[PDB]
Write a protein that binds this ligand. Structure first.
Ligand SMILES: OC[C@H]1O[C@@H](c2nc(-c3ccc4ccccc4c3)cs2)[C@H](O)[C@@H](O)[C@@H]1O
Ligand SMILES: OC[C@H]1O[C@@H](c2nc(-c3ccc4ccccc4c3)cs2)[C@H](O)[C@@H](O)[C@@H]1O
Ligand SMILES: *Cc1c(COP(=O)(O)O)cnc(C)c1O
Ligand SMILES: *Cc1c(COP(=O)(O)O)cnc(C)c1O
Lengths: 809, 809
């Protein structure tokens, strides 16, 4: 029906229909009389997977013949979401499958809704891994995603009495048609044991064996016929394991627990052994595979044939593990193995928040990975020997830069290990990379300035434009053609349509259609009634103090209080939608969700308010909900305290999808404002420099409470039980934190935020000038393509050249 | 190549080849350059499964339309073995697949060896379930096998220093292409909780929920185009289960443990809660499914539409469960629900051994199934009220017949529950059924003589002749045609070829070919060197005292001692092969394996013996090893103490496959000897009556030790460490048991056994008269077809008529 979804040829459609009926019969063992929508989804999935197989085999073949340099993206998290629509988009089958399914009397969109999200990630970091895989396939890189096949991904969020409840995300229950088990590439991973020192070097003995069984998922490039591989490891007991008899068999579960469940902390370190086991497991199995592939072509050439990218410190053990294999198994000398390791490894840092930094107790590494701790100590000694020689007498530098932290419990600083063991260290936005060089890695920067790079984050315009917003894709494609989907900088051509009446009307119609569609999705799936003519004010992201959902809450209560004070005055109507999961043990995050829903319970049932103000908590925010709500959004809330959001990627998704941003000069907000122009961005609040000035002299929240009557009222309402009549003190922890222990200076930005939110409402009253500013945003969003990001990784870190040339079909 | 394996048409072969290449590509995602033999096996499996699908769908369809009476075979055990060859045989694809694979340059026999046994059973009982499914499909009955999909079947047996080691049978590791998950027919099973009594009857509340997820495996009939279903339940945690967060997700394993592992006890009861959970799990899920199917047609008609066969007491809870559903959920009155239950249920008893009888402690049923215990108590009261009225004043009868056993711990006699709650109770051989009426169920017989039946056991001549012994099948098919494969009584026509020289030469050539093939299989897979011209003396069955492997050991040592006494005298050379698994906690069974291997270590390395006597322990005896060794056997050892082997089925397999039987008048040995004639059977030892006479006056083993010099020598050799030089006392438990606590009277049968074994050697010296006696055995083996058994169940218990008429292809 729309051109960017591809051709529906007569043969193609006929062929899809007969393969759909073949799979319903032979694969699902159903006839049409007893098939459920879920059978129909599976038949279609199997039918689309069949178009991947030829390209997958030819691509892996082609990498064997050409033997290019291979990129290994190691991440504990791949936030993939659904695969079916994405596969159709990249193979150009979407219209043909729409037509084929329509003729069989099925609605393809209904079948798409039956696919489980692959929720093998928490948020920003995990989703960056997924966008990267898409861009590496699209840029024809010989790239492999390596991670863990968690049986349970990020938990399903139910709201119960306005409180978050967690349910196990049992995403594999009905089968995963996208994965292919490769039991024959099963590899042993070792744990515990002890080190014997012999004549012929150190030997790791009396270990417990867990098997790593790989599952391959295809990653299709955008219409280039390239299909790369995501390999995820599953933990499996060896068959001699524990082997009274019955318990031995049941205790196999202990070993398999390693790949059972994703840790649901976003920017929070928990030093749990099971987490360290997951980290070693993925590293040990992946490095054996990388080396096996390398030997099927002397380790001087290893870094010419292998790049390993570490997605944060989560796979930092890749550095000692590569040393251990090269020194203990391959018998290279220390210095040669170390050169190979540094030239192979590169480290992406994702946060500056201290509580997020991985600092593993030594006693844990001692018991679990005895040999790795020895190699870490040896790395530390040689590293501090170079610091001492470059900065003689600077003993405090030696303490600050040590991989080993002294204290009550000794800890390994995994970030320090990553910098020492990597030829390149990057942040994920220019301001973040600058903060790394000025503050937390200042000392490492001064020693090896050449290692520190910026690679500003990006999003795949395939999932985040073509797939979630076909109507916007199309009206863009009507004026400038299709080429921008793999070259997003071409969106700049839209600046010459900023005064075109037809284009202004088309941009605004698509937004209205997305809002109508989302408003309807709310009424069906969650019996809630929103005015589609309201401004859609949305904050969707994990629930964290630093992301200041609470600042948003303060604005919402301010709007409420202003309506009640002057009931009969015009206010631009808004639907305020906030959504995110809280980490299950993050008390404050769980209280913020409860406050959000408690504001809703007051605001949405006030007769005086009407449909002028609605507050909706969006339940179970995940990738597939982001594909629906982001295209429906008018205002993107990016309101982190300056210096806390390393980058953000939500900000980019919304910029691409025709929403204006209200945000701080934080993360990639800075580069977004610079691309669009500051006049096309609702910037407010402290800069990094202002927060620093507040810290030097001390943050007194009382000062703001005492000077801002509007803010005092909100705090009194919270305290006195205006929003919690049956439990008047329900929110004392929130009030108490905002008044005495606010690390994120919520009150400091309150006034500038509310004023800036008035400027938003004013622009929204003028639809034409709102839409023109939206066009200026979409048109300058090109930089924020993960294609640009990956091309920069490739040229400046991996040493490989991207390509948009097609493989043969 | 051979006619009973079907036609290899040009189109059929072309079509199989192109579907094999389609599956290698689309299903396995391999090209021919990287495929392993295991990929080739999977492609073939998928290719053969594709021929099942049409017939499976049409058959289940046809049962919906015709709505026949449905048979539900409830068993905790289905000993299926491999599915690939069996599927080819019953679909007539074997020659076509041989030809199709040959042209692709593969050997189908090599690919068959890659299939894992489905070892979801211990031995006789489990394998009877598998033969029954084959016969019910072949006789066109609307029959369903219902059991548990164990993640781990019967353990893999390694021999280490002559000792049994158990390894987990991880049979699902590479996938099972034969099963189809039906997640959409998932059902809740309840545990624990408590009973509330209301106005509207009793209510089972505050239960823990385990989900039962069914997997369907096709069961093809023999060339009738019928495909029945084996439905196996897998335990699955509900997604709210336990729902700090991480442990909650890991604790899901507790619920899923229910379907994790098969209990490896053959004829031994262990009162473990996990075993009771498995028993309720399969019963609760199966009865919900049976009732759902029944309501898709008032419970008066239930027994006209439903037969439930209980394979021993393992699913006895089906009786209280059916009462609980009918009374508590469907609101029938007690008496009407009870009539329905008795008319629906039938109980097959498999053993008289007291230690095998399921006697569940009340405290276990109290905690786990509170409501079932109440219904059991109510059944007991009404049952004993009928005993009291029929036998007034006989208070001892009341104690003996009670479902509730009094004592230290109160127990439920599950066998008593089965007799009370069933319209029919059968044994599994005529002598066994007679012993049930004279001894252990005498009282139940006197009350309800009409319930007690015999159904002599049988074996499927598809797996146990056509599949394992194609060369014997063929030479039979050359003279009398193919019709006998589904009508085994036609083998009687072979009695008119008992004096045909060509047929005598053909029977003997096939035996020699089977022996050459098996001798070679030993040399390859287990580096052992047997003379193929020796008599193949084989005892294969679970290791149990009652089966008297030890009697066999005594004969073997007797032959050894006789050779050493007269080195230079001729003895018929023998290969003595003994094989079986011991239950992991069965000390004595584990000692017997060690003795067997310890005799081997002495006998096989004695230069004076030569290749005149070899002793081989056959490692990992399972269905697929039975298919190899049984066709190679000359002498079948069936030497249980009279009254202990309820039936046996091995005995039948060997009779069918051209081996002569040395055995006691025990189990179906009696009916085999009566069919063939006693002169065509090596019968020895005590009858049932003689054992009874020995018991009355007392079994003194010393008496035999004192009168049989040959036996004294063996006992002295065992005691003094002749067979265990480094541990002289290794076998003191064996000697001590044979001398003071032999329940099975091994010495009582020793003399008559050795004499009878001399008669065997004498006949073997005359090949022509040996082969003529073999023909008399094969020719009278027809009764021992599971087709006869199932036709008798159908007409005399289930009330349905078998059919050999084809469904349309
Ligand atoms: O670069 C991609 C995005 O990364 C986000 C980030 N995620 C994380 C993150 C996630 C999961 C973890 C699990 C265990 C221990 C630490 C963890 C840290 C850190 S920083 C950052 O918070 C975002 O600013 C940024 O856009
Ligand atoms: O009828 C089929 C065969 O059944 C054999 C039998 N198996 C069993 C058997 C198996 C597994 C068990 C697991 C747990 C508790 C009790 C169990 C009993 C009993 S009797 C009998 O021992 C054989 O004689 C007979 O041929
Ligand atoms: C993009 C995305 C994120 C990251 O959003 P931020 O606003 O950068 O925190 C988190 N969750 C999901 C589901 C996403 O798609
Ligand atoms: C048939 C069979 C049995 C039963 O044999 P018996 O001699 O009756 O005990 C046990 N195990 C396997 C593998 C079988 O095929």
């Amino acid at each position: 029906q729309i051109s960017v979804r591809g051709l529906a040829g007569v043969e193609n459609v006929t062929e899809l229909k007969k393969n759909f009926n073949r799979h319903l019969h032979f694969t699902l063992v159903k006839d049409r009389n007893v098939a459920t929508p879920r059978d129909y989804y599976f038949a279609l999935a199997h039918t689309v997977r069949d178009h991947l197989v030829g390209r997958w085999i030819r691509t892996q073949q082609h990498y064997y013949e050409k033997d290019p340099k291979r990129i290994y993206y190691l991440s504990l998290e791949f936030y993939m979401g659904r695969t079916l629509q994405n596969t159709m988009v990249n193979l150009a089958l979407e219209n043909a499958c729409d037509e084929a399914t329509y003729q069989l009397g099925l609605d393809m969109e209904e079948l798409e809704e039956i696919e489980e999200d692959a929720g093998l990630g928490n948020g920003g970091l995990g989703r960056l891994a997924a966008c990267f895989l898409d861009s590496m396939a699209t840029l024809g890189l010989a790239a492999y995603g390596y991670g863990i096949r968690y049986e349970f991904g990020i938990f399903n969020q139910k709201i119960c009495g306005g409180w978050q409840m967690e349910e196990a995300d049992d995403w594999l229950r009905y089968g995963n048609p996208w994965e292919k088990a490769r039991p024959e590439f099963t590899l042993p991973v070792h744990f515990y044991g002890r080190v014997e020192h012999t004549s012929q070097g150190a030997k790791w003995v009396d270990t417990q064996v867990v098997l790593a069984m790989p599952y391959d998922t295809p990653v299709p490039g955008y219409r280039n016929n390239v299909v790369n591989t995501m390999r995820l490891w599953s933990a499996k007991a060896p068959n001699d394991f524990n082997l009274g008899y019955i318990q031995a068999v049941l205790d196999r579960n202990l070993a398999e627990n390693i790949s059972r469940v994703l840790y649901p902390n976003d920017n929070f370190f928990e030093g749990k052994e099971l987490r360290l086991k997951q980290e070693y497991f993925v590293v040990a199995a992946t490095l054996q595979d990388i080396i096996r592939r390398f030997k099927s072509s002397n380790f001087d050439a290893f870094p010419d044939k292998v790049a390993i990218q570490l997605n944060d410190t989560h796979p930092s053990l890749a550095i000692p593990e590569l040393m251990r294999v090269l020194v203990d198994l391959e018998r290279l000398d220390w210095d040669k193995a170390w050169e190979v390791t540094v030239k192979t490894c590169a480290y992406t840092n994702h946060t500056v928040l201290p509580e997020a930094l991985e600092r593993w107790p030594v006693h844990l590494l001692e018991t679990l990975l005895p040999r790795h701790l020895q190699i870490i100590y040896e790395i530390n000694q040689r590293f501090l020997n170079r610091v001492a020689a470059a900065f003689p007498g600077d003993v405090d530098r030696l303490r600050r830069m040590s991989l080993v932290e002294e204290g009550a419990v000794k800890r390994i600083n995994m970030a320090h290990l990553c910098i020492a063991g990597s030829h390149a260290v990057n942040g994920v936005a220019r301001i973040h990379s600058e903060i790394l060089k000025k503050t937390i890695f200042k000392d490492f920067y001064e020693l090896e300035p050449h290692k520190f790079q910026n690679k500003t984050n990006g999003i795949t315009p395939r999932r985040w434009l073509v797939l979630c917003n076909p109507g916007l894709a199309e009206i863009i494609a009507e004026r400038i053609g299709e080429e921008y989907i793999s070259d997003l900088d071409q969106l700049r051509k839209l600046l010459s349509y900023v005064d075109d009446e037809a284009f202004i009307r088309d941009v605004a119609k698509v937004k209205q259609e997305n809002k109508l569609k989302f408003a309807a999705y709310l009424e069906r799936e969650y019996k809630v009634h929103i005015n589609p003519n309201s401004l859609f004010d949305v904050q969707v992201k994990r629930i964290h103090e630093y992301k200041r959902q609470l600042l948003n809450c303060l604005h919402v209560i301010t709007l409420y209080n202003r309506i009640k004070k002057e009931p009969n005055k015009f206010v631009v109507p808004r639907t305020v939608m906030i959504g995110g999961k809280a980490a299950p043990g993050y008390h404050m995050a769980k209280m913020i969700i409860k406050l959000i829903t408690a504001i809703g319970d007051v605001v949405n049932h006030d007769p005086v308010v009407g449909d002028r103000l609605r507050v909706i908590f969006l339940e179970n925010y995940r990738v597939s909900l982001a594909e629906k709500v982001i295209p429906a959004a008018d205002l993107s809330e990016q309101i982190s305290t300056a210096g806390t959001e390393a980058s953000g990627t939500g900000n980019m998704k919304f910029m691409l999808n025709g929403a204006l941003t209200i945000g701080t000069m934080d993360g990639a907000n800075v580069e977004m404002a610079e691309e669009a122009g500051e006049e096309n961005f609702f910037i407010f609040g402290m800069r990094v420099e202002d927060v620093d000035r507040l810290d030097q002299r001390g943050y007194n929240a009382q000062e703001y409470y005492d000077r801002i009557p509007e803010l005092r009222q909100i705090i009194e309402q919270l305290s006195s039980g205006f929003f919690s009549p049956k439990q008047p003190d329900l929110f004392k922890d929130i009030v108490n934190m905002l008044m005495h222990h606010d690390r994120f200076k919520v009150f400091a930005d309150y006034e500038e935020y509310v004023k800036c939110q008035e400027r938003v409402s004013a622009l929204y009253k003028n639809p034409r000038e709102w839409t023109r500013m939206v066009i200026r945003n979409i048109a300058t969003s090109g930089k924020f393509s993960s294609d640009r990001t990956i091309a920069q990784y490739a040229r400046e870190i991996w040493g490989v050249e991207p390509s948009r040339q097609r493989l043969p079909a």
